[PDB]
Design a binder for this molecule. Structure first.
Ligand SMILES: *[C@H]1[C@@H](C)[C@H]2[C@@H]([C@H](O)[C@H]3[C@H]4[C@H]([C@H](OC(C)=O)[C@H](OC(C)=O)[C@@]32C)[C@]2(C)[C@H](C[C@@H]3O[C@@H]3[C@@H]2OC(C)=O)C(=O)[C@@H]4O)[C@]2(C)[C@@]1(O)OC(=O)[C@@]2(C)O
Ligand SMILES: Nc1nc2c(ncn2[C@@H]2O[C@H](COP(=O)(O)OP(=O)(O)OP(=O)(O)O)[C@@H](O)[C@H]2O)c(=O)[nH]1
Ligand SMILES: Nc1ncnc2c1ncn2[C@@H]1O[C@H](COP(=O)(O)OP(=O)(O)CP(=O)(O)O)[C@@H](O)[C@H]1O
Ligand SMILES: Nc1nc2c(ncn2[C@@H]2O[C@H](COP(=O)(O)OP(=O)(O)O)[C@@H](O)[C@H]2O)c(=O)[nH]1
Ligand SMILES: [Ca+2]
Ligand SMILES: [Mg+2]
Ligand SMILES: [Mg+2]
Lengths: 54, 427, 437, 347
């Protein structure tokens, strides 16, 4: 019912109609996670190569 | 995204040769290595299996291995024998005498470094090697013993690449020697640890398909191999032609293998039609779908109804209604939902390739990770124990330096594998 | 004028990117070579379309866009496609092998290797900006790259561009076109890690798009091409306010202001109408009332759910074509009496309306018919949480058995991250329920 | 073959439906959590509606309407009638009621309570929730609600009920209503009068045996249970004969016209909020409407039950009826017991 903020231009228009009213990780921390994952992959591969060495 | 193919021993080289004949035909490559096809769809991913050589030739990225020269001489003189890179024929003279120990520890140990040198030469010419595929039997000595030795060595040098195998399981129904259960058990022990994907091709099933369905009273190994090479073509279609699903070895593994040890697949193929008047009969998509899921079309002698599917890959080939394919695949799952584990939602994936195989207007290849595969390993285990109880025929192996303990360990791990399937069959 | 950089990650992100920039070019009259005859300010400018396009001295209009994929064949099609002249090589980044539908492989293993290169190429674009607003990020939930690399990228963008807004266009997985069994894992993993870094995310369920194409475009078996052209129309409707003159949603901050009162609950539902087959011989053109009423039909939503059984926090209506406020307000008045629309007690019951007189542009030879008027409704309704429930249920079924988990642990991810992500989702479902019931 | 799942084990109605479905040989019961079903016989609480209708190749149907609880909870029903212009505050067939919370319409209730007493007219009230207190004193009613510690409703007690003879007994009418996926409203032709066996006593507003007609309460505290009819259940043939013999009228005219009007009015009111007409899944549901009849043969709605049991005598027919119009209508297999409620007056 209540229409507000009516704006018009050559390209179109905009408005609001109200019916009724109401009632971060640091760079170092990121680097740490990626390197810790790489270390776990590295450890896994080392354990495999040791197993194969046996 | 290159794959390196290896074929070891008599069975391995004979199915291997057949495989290259089949896919060469599909990709338009003749025995000389020249492309004579009429579709760029044939060449779009031909790099996966073929190296491009001077003169615009295509050479299989294939390494042929055996501890005796016999079979590989026959491959060389075969239909497409000329296509293979001559430097990739690596062979000894002694043979392995159907002895896993000879293939794995003595005779094969002497030859394995030569093979690895060829593997390395091929791998170095790869823009981005995705992994390896091995064709071999488990019942003999070379394919079984030396094949699993190679797999172990390859994993050591390429620990971050995918290892894929087409493994022919032995059966008393189609047997060369009594020690096949020993060789197979020793090999499964290796495969459980060192492969990502293993296609279990049961000679029992291949024979029964030839006898019962295809009405062949007396199948030869060559007739068994037609089924295998046709199936191999089907299961590798997604790797060889443009597509969305399972387009590489790793993505297939991620889709098919929920637990690392349970990576043994039942392959299937359709249509399988006996000769006569019905061979010309037109097949419908509903008929293809029903047949591909039929136990009589499976290449591993296991009853799918005796277990549950963890994962399934289905691939249709030929001109057909994509809508109809989707509808029929959904029908199978919805009409037989109890046989698909409910704790892996949407575990059936379907691909469709335009290019059909030779001699068929349409076909379907099935790849199932079913807990019913435990029946296969139980069979080998029982056959193993019947002999091992009395240490029968063990002298063939102890003579090559092996101890009884290594047999006990192999048996225990294969029995662990069986119980692991049963666990998820009941879950 | 303030610039926006678009980032397209993985196959879905890239291919949807292709459709959007094709459409943008058609809408702005930019040719495949980047020339724009109507642009009289040669070699520069601060017009509204410059938000998405930079200009070269030779008059080439170049997308402020970066394409990244961990495998080259999809971006290679961009490199040799019809719009290959539009992009500068440095804008197109490719790796050698992909994330294999594995979040951990995309985020940790391959992501670590390529993230710095991507940020360098993004920095090059940012340096060309006088007043960078922020980023529009296109990706799938289900892919290893779309899920894994995106969440890493989003984290780093918050570090390197702390004051900039970040919007997502995210493809939610549907079995009918999906390529992996583990896509529920990847979806929940990327949502957990991305949540704090995204200001507003527009989720598109391939299920909904697939069925709209079958139902309204009579396509028996929709392809990504069919899906993406429809998606691009919706995306264009949403970004039109950034690329044309107007007073509603004119910058990225306003999207958050207008659609997202609660930061975590930042997933607005998009509903679009009309979708009409170009092969439809006889079509009676739909009125403002008819297309507006269609915005409250679940069959037209980008995610199948039921807003009657939730609550609204905000609602925007974005019209394109022959529309005037009088007909919009009349339409809303009657709809409110017929339909169940319930706002949360702490928000006003109302609608922000934007109209652009230019009707929707359709790709020549495409599936969509030209219409005289179309609308995209953006509503922040708690009902979209139905999508999280479905996803979390599939997650629980598999994770209870640890199915496929070894693939992720094998890439160096800790198993604990699964449960941490799942716990974050459980909290999110709780947040929605508290607000909506 | 169609497939279904059972997720409410305590439901007598749908246990029977399940039995009937299986007996056709064209239905198969899957495990509780198998998602690949055609039919869900769902749980009463937190039914996962959000997971329905997302299975390609499966038309999915469920035996509950999402949102129907607005009608089927004590406090929700009052609010629904009061706030809906279809029904309105001046609704003639719903007793004057107020929603009251412990420590809300408490102050509004007391305003009405006064002139009730300050006007030489009855002023008995009843307080309840989904533990019941009938009283003449406002303070007794408001005190009782807080001591219970639960959301409650305070309703005008019908002091002039229709009393069956012999016995001078109170009763209530249960009607079973089936709403299918097309929102057809089917009234089961068999209802039941759940009777008191104790004479109605306006002097003492205890002896719940004569004031509360619940089938269970009569069983425990009433010395005369089963006296006048088996199980304190009188069915429509007998009740109709009574009305003809005693009051010179019929069940259809004096009572059923009103009952059909009330049912249709209630369900058409919430139809926009719960209809599954254009939804990705479909709903049907069985309701139990409870009615009071005063001595002027005016019908009053008391409550709506979203998960009704049935009379032992009527289980077979009703459950078979549910299979016929609600289930087989969606999933066809390889004189009607219902009255379809529809009315289109032009004005
Ligand atoms: C054994 C003999 C059984 C093989 C034969 C041909 O190469 C095979 C053709 C194949 C036949 O299939 C039948 C009989 O139903 C059969 O292969 C079998 C049974 O495994 C033949 C005769 C054909 C006809 C195939 C075309 C089409 O796909 C149908 C069928 O194969 C399938 C999938 O069932 C061919 O045309 C094959 O050439 C020989 C020579 C055989 O005699 O020894 C072989 O090594 C053989 C298999 O190549
Ligand atoms: N709508 C739409 N969805 C797509 C498209 N491409 C892929 N998808 C969806 O995205 C999901 C798979 O993720 P992708 O984007 O293909 O994978 P990716 O981002 O490249 O990651 P990886 O390939 O694993 O490295 C599936 O659910 C697909 O249905 C597309 O072009 N359009
Ligand atoms: N306003 C009123 N006037 C007169 N009697 C009333 C009344 N409200 C309730 N009653 C009596 O109290 C009984 C029980 O009321 P109520 O409807 O709360 O119980 P209930 O919830 O168990 C019925 P159901 O088992 O069907 O859910 C009614 O059957 C009726 O006998
Ligand atoms: N399908 C098939 N199986 C074979 C073939 N040759 C041998 N086998 C099986 O393989 C086992 C013997 O192994 P083989 O390959 O001959 O020994 P190897 O040369 O030492 O590897 C037995 O189980 C045989 O049944 C063949 O050509 N086809
Ligand atoms: Ca300019
Ligand atoms: Mg041999
Ligand atoms: Mg990809």
């Amino acid at each position: 019912m209540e229409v507000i903020e009516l704006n018009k231009c050559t390209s179109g228009q905009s408005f609001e109609v109200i019916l009724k009213p109401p009632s971060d990780p640091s760079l170092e921390e990121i680097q740490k996670k990626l390197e810790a994952a790489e270390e776990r992959r590295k450890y896994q591969e080392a354990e495999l190569l040791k197993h194969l060495a046996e | 995204r290159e794959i390196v193919h290896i074929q070891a021993g008599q069975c391995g080289n004979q199915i291997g040769a057949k495989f290259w004949e089949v896919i060469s035909d599909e990709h338009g490559i003749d025995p000389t290595g020249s492309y004579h096809g009429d579709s760029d769809l044939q060449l779009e991913r031909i790099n996966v299996y073929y190296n491009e050589a001077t003169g615009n030739k295509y050479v299989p990225r294939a390494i042929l291995v055996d501890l005796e020269p016999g079979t590989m001489d026959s491959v060389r003189s075969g239909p497409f024998g000329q296509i293979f890179r001559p430097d990739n024929f690596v062979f000894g003279q002694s043979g392995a005498g159907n002895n896993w120990a000879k293939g794995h520890y003595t005779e094969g140990a002497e030859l394995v470094d030569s093979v690895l040198d060829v593997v390395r030469k091929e791998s170095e010419s790869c823009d981005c090697l995705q992994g390896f595929q091995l064709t071999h039997s488990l019942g003999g000595g070379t394919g079984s013993g030396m094949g699993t030795l190679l797999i172990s060595k390859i994993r050591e040098e390429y620990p971050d690449r995918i290892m894929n195998t087409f493994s022919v399981m032995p059966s008393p129904k189609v047997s060369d020697t009594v020690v096949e259960p020993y060789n197979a058990t020793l090999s499964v022990h290796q495969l459980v640890e060192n492969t990502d994907e293993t296609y279990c091709i049961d000679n029992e099933a291949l024979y029964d398909i030839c006898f019962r369905t295809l009405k062949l009273t007396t199948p030869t190994y060559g007739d068994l191999n037609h089924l295998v090479s046709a199936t191999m073509s089907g299961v590798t279609t997604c790797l060889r032609f443009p597509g969305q699903l399972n387009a590489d070895l790793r993505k297939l593994a991620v889709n098919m293998v929920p637990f690392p040890r349970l990576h043994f697949f039942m392959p299937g193929f359709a249509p399988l039609t006996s000769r006569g008047s019905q061979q010309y009969r037109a097949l419908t998509v509903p008929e293809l779908t029903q047949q591909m899921f039929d136990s009589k079309n499976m290449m591993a002698a296991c009853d799918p109804r005796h277990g549950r599917y963890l994962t399934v890959a289905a691939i249709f080939r030929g001109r057909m209604s994509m809508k109809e394919v989707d509808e029929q695949m959904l029908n199978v799952q919805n009409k037989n939902s109890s046989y698909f584990v409910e704790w892996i939602p949407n575990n059936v994936k379907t691909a469709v390739c335009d290019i059909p195989p030779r001699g068929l207007k349409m076909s379907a290849t099935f790849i199932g990770n079913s807990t019913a595969i435990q029946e296969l390993f139980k069979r080998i285990s029982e056959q193993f124990t019947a002999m091992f109880r009395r240490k029968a025929f063990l002298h063939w192996y102890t003579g090559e330096g092996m101890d009884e303990m290594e047999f006990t360990e192999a048996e225990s791990n294969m029995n662990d594998l069986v119980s692991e399937y049963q666990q998820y069959q009941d879950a | 004028m303030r610039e926006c950089i678009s980032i397209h990650v993985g196959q879905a992100g890239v291919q949807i990117g292709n459709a959007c920039w094709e459409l943008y070019c058609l809408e702005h009259g930019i040719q495949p070579d980047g020339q724009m005859p109507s642009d009289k300010t040669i070699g520069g400018g601060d017009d509204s379309f410059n938000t998405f396009f930079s200009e070269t001295g030779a008059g080439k209009h170049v997308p402020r866009a970066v394409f990244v994929d961990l495998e080259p064949t999809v971006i290679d099609e961009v490199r040799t496609g019809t719009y290959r002249q539009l992009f500068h090589p440095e804008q197109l980044i490719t790796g050698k092998e992909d994330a294999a539908n594995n979040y951990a492989r995309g985020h940790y293993t391959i992501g670590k290797e390529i993230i710095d290169l991507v940020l360098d190429r993004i920095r090059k674009l940012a340096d060309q900006c006088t007043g960078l607003q922020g980023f529009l990020v296109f990706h799938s939930f289900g892919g290893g790259t779309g899920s894994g690399f995106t969440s890493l990228l989003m984290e780093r963008l918050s570090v390197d561009y702390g004051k900039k807004s970040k919007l997502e266009f995210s493809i939610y997985p549907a079995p009918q076109v999906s390529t992996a069994v583990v896509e529920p894992y990847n979806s929940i993993l990327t949502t957990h890690t991305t949540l704090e870094h995204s200001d507003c995310a527009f989720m598109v369920d391939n299920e909904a798009i697939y069925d709209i194409c079958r139902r309204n475009l009579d396509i028996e078996r929709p392809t990504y091409t069919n899906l993406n052209r429809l998606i691009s129309q919706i995306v264009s409707s949403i970004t039109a306010s950034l690329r044309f003159d107007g007073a509603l949603n004119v910058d990225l901050t306003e999207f958050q202001t207008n659609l997202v009162p609660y930061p975590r609950i930042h997933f607005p539902l998009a509903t679009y109408a009309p979708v009409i087959s170009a092969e439809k011989a006889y079509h009676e053109q739909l009125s403002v009332a008819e297309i507006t009423n269609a915005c409250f039909e679940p069959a037209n939503q980008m995610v199948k759910c039921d807003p009657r059984h939730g609550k609204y926090m905000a609602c925007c209506l974005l019209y394109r074509g022959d529309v005037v406020p009088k007909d919009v307000n009349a339409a809303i008045a009657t709809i409110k009496t017929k339909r169940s629309i319930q706002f949360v007690d702490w928000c006003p019951t109302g609608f922000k309306v934007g109209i652009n007189y230019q009707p929707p542009t359709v790709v020549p030879g495409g599936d969509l018919a030209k219409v005289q008027r179309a609308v995209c409704m953006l509503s922040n309704t708690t009902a979209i949480a139905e999508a999280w429930a479905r996803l979390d249920h599939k997650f629980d079924l598999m994770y209870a058995k640890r199915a496929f988990v070894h693939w992720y642990v094998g890439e160096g991810m800790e198993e604990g991250e699964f449960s941490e992500a799942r716990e974050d989702m459980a909290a999110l479902e709780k947040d929605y329920e508290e607000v909506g019931v | 073959m169609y497939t279904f799942v059972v997720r409410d084990e305590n439901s007598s109605v749908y246990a029977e439906v399940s039995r009937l479905l299986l007996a056709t040989g064209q239905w198969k019961r899957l495990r509780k959590d198998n998602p690949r079903f055609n039919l869900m016989l769902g749980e009463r609480n937190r039914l996962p509606f959000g997971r329905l209708g997302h299975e390609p190749g499966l038309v999915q149907l469920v035996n509950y309407y999402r949102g129907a609880d607005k009608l089927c909870r004590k406090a929700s029903l009052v609010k629904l009638i009061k706030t809906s212009p279809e029904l309105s505050e001046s609704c003639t067939w719903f007793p004057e009621s107020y929603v009251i919370y412990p420590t809300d319409e408490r102050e509004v209730f007391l305003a009405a309570y006064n002139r009730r007493r300050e006007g030489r007219e009855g002023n008995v009230w009843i307080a309840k929730s989904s533990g019941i207190l009938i009283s003449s004193e406002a303070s007794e009613l408001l005190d009782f609600i807080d001591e219970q510690g639960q959301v409650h409703v305070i309703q005008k007690y019908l002091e002039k009920p229709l009393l069956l003879e012999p016995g001078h007994r109170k009763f209530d009418i249960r009607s079973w209503v089936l709403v299918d996926h097309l929102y057809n409203i089917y009234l089961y032709r068999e209802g039941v009068l759940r009777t008191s066996s104790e004479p109605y006593n306006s002097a003492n507003f205890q002896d719940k045996t004569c004031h509360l007609t619940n089938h269970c309460i009569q069983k425990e505290y009433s010395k005369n249970y089963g006296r006048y009819e088996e199980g304190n259940e009188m069915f429509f043939e007998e009740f109709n004969q009574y009305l003809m013999d005693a009051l010179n009228t019929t069940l259809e005219n004096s009572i059923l016209l009103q009952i059909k009007h009330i049912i249709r009015s209630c369900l058409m009111c919430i139809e926009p909020a719960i209809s599954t007409k254009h939804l990705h899944y479909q709903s049907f549901q069985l309701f139990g409407f409870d009615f009071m009849v005063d001595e002027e043969l005016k019908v009053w709605l008391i409550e709506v039950n979203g998960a009704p049991a049935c009379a032992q005598k009527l289980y077979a027919e009703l459950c078979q009826g549910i299979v016929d119009v609600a289930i087989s209508s969606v999933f066809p297999l390889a004189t009607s017991i219902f009255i379809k409620l529809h009315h289109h007056h032009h004005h």
